[PDB]
Every structure is written in C-alpha cells, then in structure tokens.
Design an enzyme around this catalytic site. Structure first.
Site, PDB file in Angstrom:
ATOM      1  CG  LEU A  17       7.385  -0.012  -2.597  1.00 27.32           C
ATOM      2  CD1 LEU A  17       6.877   1.290  -2.028  1.00 27.32           C
ATOM      3  CD2 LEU A  17       8.646   0.222  -3.403  1.00 27.32           C
ATOM      4  N   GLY A  18       7.437  -3.872  -0.071  1.00 27.93           N
ATOM      5  CA  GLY A  18       7.625  -4.674   1.127  1.00 27.93           C
ATOM      6  C   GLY A  18       6.395  -5.482   1.472  1.00 27.93           C
ATOM      7  N   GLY A  20       4.484  -8.493   4.579  1.00 26.58           N
ATOM      8  CA  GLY A  20       4.353  -8.792   5.998  1.00 26.58           C
ATOM      9  C   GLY A  20       3.050  -9.478   6.346  1.00 26.58           C
ATOM     10  CB  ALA A  21       1.693 -10.648   9.600  1.00 25.45           C
ATOM     11  CG  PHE A  22       1.433  -5.113   7.067  1.00 25.37           C
ATOM     12  CD1 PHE A  22       2.732  -5.585   7.167  1.00 25.37           C
ATOM     13  CD2 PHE A  22       1.106  -4.325   5.972  1.00 25.37           C
ATOM     14  CE1 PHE A  22       3.679  -5.270   6.201  1.00 25.37           C
ATOM     15  CE2 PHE A  22       2.050  -4.034   4.997  1.00 25.37           C
ATOM     16  CZ  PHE A  22       3.331  -4.501   5.120  1.00 25.37           C
ATOM     17  N   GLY A  23      -0.104  -7.245   5.424  1.00 16.48           N
ATOM     18  CA  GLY A  23      -0.445  -7.200   4.012  1.00 16.48           C
ATOM     19  C   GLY A  23       0.768  -6.820   3.177  1.00 16.48           C
ATOM     20  CB  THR A  24       1.604  -6.517   0.000  1.00 19.12           C
ATOM     21  OG1 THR A  24       1.527  -7.885   0.394  1.00 19.12           O
ATOM     22  CG2 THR A  24       2.771  -6.336  -0.949  1.00 19.12           C
ATOM     23  CE  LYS A  44       0.727  -0.787   6.090  1.00 21.33           C
ATOM     24  NZ  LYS A  44       1.550   0.100   6.946  1.00 21.33           N
ATOM     25  CG  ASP A 139       2.418   0.096  15.678  1.00 22.81           C
ATOM     26  OD1 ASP A 139       3.363  -0.227  16.441  1.00 22.81           O
ATOM     27  OD2 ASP A 139       2.236  -0.423  14.547  1.00 22.81           O
ATOM     28  NE  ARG A 143       6.393  -1.676  13.568  1.00 21.52           N
ATOM     29  CZ  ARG A 143       6.722  -1.852  14.848  1.00 21.52           C
ATOM     30  NH1 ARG A 143       7.992  -2.030  15.198  1.00 21.52           N
ATOM     31  NH2 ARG A 143       5.784  -1.858  15.787  1.00 21.52           N
ATOM     32  CG  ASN A 144       4.547   2.454  12.104  1.00 22.59           C
ATOM     33  OD1 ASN A 144       3.985   1.997  13.102  1.00 22.59           O
ATOM     34  ND2 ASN A 144       4.556   1.794  10.965  1.00 22.59           N
ATOM     35  CG  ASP A 157       1.309   2.317   9.473  1.00 33.89           C
ATOM     36  OD1 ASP A 157       1.433   2.854   8.352  1.00 33.89           O
ATOM     37  OD2 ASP A 157       1.496   1.098   9.666  1.00 33.89           O
TER      38      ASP A 157
HETATM   39  C1  LIG Z   1      10.496  -0.017   6.911  1.00 35.44           C
HETATM   40  C2  LIG Z   1       9.506   0.470   5.888  1.00 35.44           C
HETATM   41  C3  LIG Z   1       8.134   0.053   6.299  1.00 35.44           C
HETATM   42  O1  LIG Z   1       7.993  -0.719   7.240  1.00 35.44           O
HETATM   43  N1  LIG Z   1       7.077   0.565   5.634  1.00 35.44           N
HETATM   44  C4  LIG Z   1       5.713   0.289   6.055  1.00 35.44           C
HETATM   45  C5  LIG Z   1       4.950   1.286   5.341  1.00 35.44           C
HETATM   46  N2  LIG Z   1       3.656   1.713   5.331  1.00 35.44           N
HETATM   47  C6  LIG Z   1       3.551   2.558   4.324  1.00 35.44           C
HETATM   48  C7  LIG Z   1       2.221   3.059   3.946  1.00 35.44           C
HETATM   49  C8  LIG Z   1       1.350   3.523   4.927  1.00 35.44           C
HETATM   50  C9  LIG Z   1       0.091   4.021   4.612  1.00 35.44           C
HETATM   51  C10 LIG Z   1      -0.778   4.562   5.688  1.00 35.44           C
HETATM   52  C11 LIG Z   1      -1.493   3.889   6.691  1.00 35.44           C
HETATM   53  N3  LIG Z   1      -2.158   4.717   7.475  1.00 35.44           N
HETATM   54  N4  LIG Z   1      -1.868   5.956   6.970  1.00 35.44           N
HETATM   55  C12 LIG Z   1      -2.351   7.262   7.472  1.00 35.44           C
HETATM   56  F1  LIG Z   1      -1.723   7.510   8.639  1.00 35.44           F
HETATM   57  F2  LIG Z   1      -3.682   7.246   7.686  1.00 35.44           F
HETATM   58  C13 LIG Z   1      -1.035   5.893   5.908  1.00 35.44           C
HETATM   59  C14 LIG Z   1      -0.455   7.078   5.222  1.00 35.44           C
HETATM   60  C15 LIG Z   1      -0.273   4.026   3.275  1.00 35.44           C
HETATM   61  F3  LIG Z   1      -1.457   4.574   2.931  1.00 35.44           F
HETATM   62  C16 LIG Z   1       0.530   3.542   2.274  1.00 35.44           C
HETATM   63  C17 LIG Z   1       1.762   3.064   2.638  1.00 35.44           C
HETATM   64  F4  LIG Z   1       2.552   2.557   1.670  1.00 35.44           F
HETATM   65  N5  LIG Z   1       4.779   2.750   3.702  1.00 35.44           N
HETATM   66  C18 LIG Z   1       5.129   3.673   2.639  1.00 35.44           C
HETATM   67  C19 LIG Z   1       6.161   3.369   1.763  1.00 35.44           C
HETATM   68  C20 LIG Z   1       6.533   4.380   0.902  1.00 35.44           C
HETATM   69  N6  LIG Z   1       5.959   5.580   0.883  1.00 35.44           N
HETATM   70  C21 LIG Z   1       4.972   5.740   1.756  1.00 35.44           C
HETATM   71  N7  LIG Z   1       4.506   4.851   2.640  1.00 35.44           N
HETATM   72  C22 LIG Z   1       5.681   1.905   4.365  1.00 35.44           C
HETATM   73  C23 LIG Z   1       7.102   1.428   4.455  1.00 35.44           C
END
Ligand SMILES: *CCC(=O)N1Cc2nc(-c3cc(-c4cnn(C(F)F)c4C)c(F)cc3F)n(-c3ccncn3)c2C1
Length: 277
Positions: A17-18, A20-24, A44, A139, A143-144, A157
């Site tokens: 889906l996307g 970055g430096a954080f991972g994927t 994530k 944060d 974007r979050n 996040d």
């Molecule tokens: C502009 C879109 C973008 O930047 N995205 C970044 C992103 N992160 C996630 C995502 C986040 C998490 C996650 C991390 N910490 N927690 C929680 F607060 F403890 C969570 C829920 C994750 F586990 C999976 C994850 F993919 N997404 C995302 C994309 C689609 N559906 C859900 N999350 C995005 C998009």
C-alpha cells in the site's frame, strides 16, 4: 488488555500500500486461530533493528497500544495483533480510503465545509479519548488519521513512537523541539498543525524552511498562515493551539465543543467554492 500474538501462518500479505523510512504497509488477509473467517487487514512491517528494545519490552509497549480498545472510541484505531520475527509487524482492520492527508489532496474540489469541520471534531474526540487513557500520541498529523468512510476518520500510530525509542519538527510544539517534552498539551499543538493541513487541502507546513530553523522562527512569533477558506473564528482556534505556554492552549474537550458549534453552521466558518448548493 487483549494483545493477540499472531503466527506468520495466520495472516498473508497480498500487496504493498505504501513505503518509507519507517518500513512498509501491506494490504493482507487474516484467519484468526480458532476461527474460520477471512478478515481484510493492513500490516505495518517496521524496519529491522531500529529499536534497541528486546522482544519482551516491545510486547509491553504493544500491550499498551492494545489496551486503548477498552473501553474504546470510534475515532481511534484498534491494534488487532502483533507478529514478532526479525521485524515488528502490526495488524489492524484495513481502512480502504487510506490516510486523510492523501484523501484531501486527491479530493480537494469535492470537499465541503461540513466534511472539514466534522473531521476536526472526530480527531479531537479521538485525541480527547487518548488523553483520558493517559496516552500521549507524540505524532498526530493528517498522515496519521485514516479514513474508514469519508464521514468517519480514526487516529492511528499512537504509542508507535514509544515502541521505537526523521523527527516531525514542523508538527511539534516548541517545548518538544527544545527539550523533548511531550504532554497532551504538545499534542494540542500537533492538532492545530493537523487542522491547518486539512484547511489547506494537504499543504506542507513551513514549505521551503529547513527543519533546523523552525524553533527560531516560532520564537519570533511566526506561525502557519491563515488558510484562504478560514474565517478569523477558525484561524483563532488553530492560533491558540500554537501558544508558547502549554497550559494556555485549549484542551481537546474544549476543541470538541468549539468545532461542534461550527459544524452546526459550516458555511459561516469556512468559505469554500462549491458549497453554494
Ligand atoms: C497517507 C497514508 C499513510 O501514511 N499511512 C500510514 C499508515 N499506517 C497504517 C498502519 C498503522 C498501524 C498501527 C501502528 N500503531 N497502531 C496502533 F495505534 F497501535 C496501528 C493501528 C498498523 F498496525 C497497520 C497499518 F497499516 N496505515 C493503514 C493503512 C490502511 N489501513 C490501516 N492502516 C497507514 C497509511
């Protein structure tokens, strides 16, 4: 309270889906252990060996992120599980419309005042819930904020910064930049920058200004400019989020009330071409 430790056989990664430096971030599918059901998830996968924490200390941080589901809030994401191998994998329900930042950039000429003000209310409701759980996000940014449906947004996040141990200087309160002080009042500052991102339809804050110069610019009294669609009433609320004294900034509870009043008569607070229906 309920942290599910997932085995790599329980879930599968389908497409990216996307990055970055954080991972994927991957769009995947999950079959819970004692269940015969396929659940669409977002995975994530964080970048390996970034954090010095052992798997036991990572689990403690993930337990806190999972505890947020109790009692819960509709505007805060739910960590469904964690998979710990050489990398950390976080699992949640898939938000099909992605993040609010990409959404406002891609749908700019179709977003009316009703939408923008309702999202501000929803983000303040989720942030106010995290403050009730004694959790500092650290944060908050557009974007979050994820889009479940255009009329339902959720904050993601939270606790991810504490799990890890590029710094988002342009969203941080002056006290966080200078002393690494993070409170619910420094989250109020980030909330103001998030509202500014939405009101500008995804503009980059302090564009062109290097991150090294942000702290001195804030000390001179320079703030993010008033977006074209905002009346002085809306701008004054973002402006109060950017006060030097953290205790003088509005509380999320107050921000809910202010933005809720504005959402009852949105054409009076936001002037958008296309709302003249
Ligand atoms: C502009 C879109 C973008 O930047 N995205 C970044 C992103 N992160 C996630 C995502 C986040 C998490 C996650 C991390 N910490 N927690 C929680 F607060 F403890 C969570 C829920 C994750 F586990 C999976 C994850 F993919 N997404 C995302 C994309 C689609 N559906 C859900 N999350 C995005 C998009």
């Amino acid at each position: 309270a309920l942290l599910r430790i997932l085995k790599e056989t329980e879930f599968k990664k389908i497409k990216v889906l996307g990055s970055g430096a954080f991972g994927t971030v991957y769009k995947g599918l999950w079959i819970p252990e004692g269940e015969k059901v396929k659940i669409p998830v977002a995975i994530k996968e964080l970048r390996e060996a970034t954090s010095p924490k052992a798997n036991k200390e990572i689990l403690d941080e993930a337990y806190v992120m999972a505890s947020v589901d109790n009692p819960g809030n509709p505007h805060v994401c739910r960590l469904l599980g964690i998979c710990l191998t050489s990398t950390v994998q976080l699992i949640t329900q898939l938000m099909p419309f992605g993040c609010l930042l990409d959404y406002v950039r891609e749908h700019k000429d179709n977003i009316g005042s009703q939408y923008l003000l309702n999202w501000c209310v929803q983000i303040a409701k989720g942030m106010n819930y995290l403050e009730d759980r004694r959790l500092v996000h650290r944060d908050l940014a557009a974007r979050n904020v994820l889009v479940k449906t255009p009329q339902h947004v959720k904050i993601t996040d939270f606790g991810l910064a504490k799990l890890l141990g590029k710094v988002p200087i342009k969203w941080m309160a002056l006290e966080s930049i200078l002393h690494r002080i993070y409170t619910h009042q420094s989250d109020v500052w980030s909330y103001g920058v998030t509202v500014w991102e939405l009101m500008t339809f995804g503009s980059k804050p302090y564009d062109g200004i290097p991150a090294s110069e942000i702290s001195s610019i804030l000390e001179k009294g320079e703030r993010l400019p008033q977006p074209p669609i905002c009346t002085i009433d809306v701008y004054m609320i973002m402006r109060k989020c950017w006060m030097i004294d953290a205790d003088s900034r509005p509380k999320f509870r107050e921000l809910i009330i202010e933005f809720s009043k504005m959402a009852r008569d949105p054409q009076r607070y936001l002037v958008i071409q296309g709302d003249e229906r």
